[PDB]
């Protein structure tokens, strides 16, 4: 077995994890959604 990604890990073929985690991307999306819902488009041109 040994999966497929582990097999590719050998022979010097690795994967670099993303700098921004999925949780941080979700937090960005939630902040954008909250800004759009509460402040409309005002927060995109200054303070909310």
């Amino acid at each position: 077995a040994r999966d497929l990604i582990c097999a590719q890990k050998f022979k010097g073929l690795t994967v670099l994890p993303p700098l921004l985690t999925d949780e941080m991307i979700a937090q960005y999306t939630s902040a954008l959604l909250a800004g759009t819902i509460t402040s409309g488009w005002t927060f995109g041109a200054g303070a909310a």
Binding site: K9, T14, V15, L16, P17
Partner: protein
């Protein structure tokens, strides 16, 4: 992870995609570059994703 030669000569080393437990720095097996070795407990070893 050097913060710049001008600022300081202290550096940090990031080993990519390896668990710290089975491959630490203090092992006498000399995992390549025998003279190039970080101190065993210079700073706490942090395991990141």
């Amino acid at each position: 992870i050097t913060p710049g030669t001008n600022t300081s000569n202290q550096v940090a080393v990031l080993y990519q995609g390896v668990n710290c437990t089975e491959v630490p720095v203090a092992i006498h097996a000399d995992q390549l570059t025998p003279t190039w070795r970080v101190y065993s407990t210079g700073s706490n070893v942090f395991q990141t994703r």
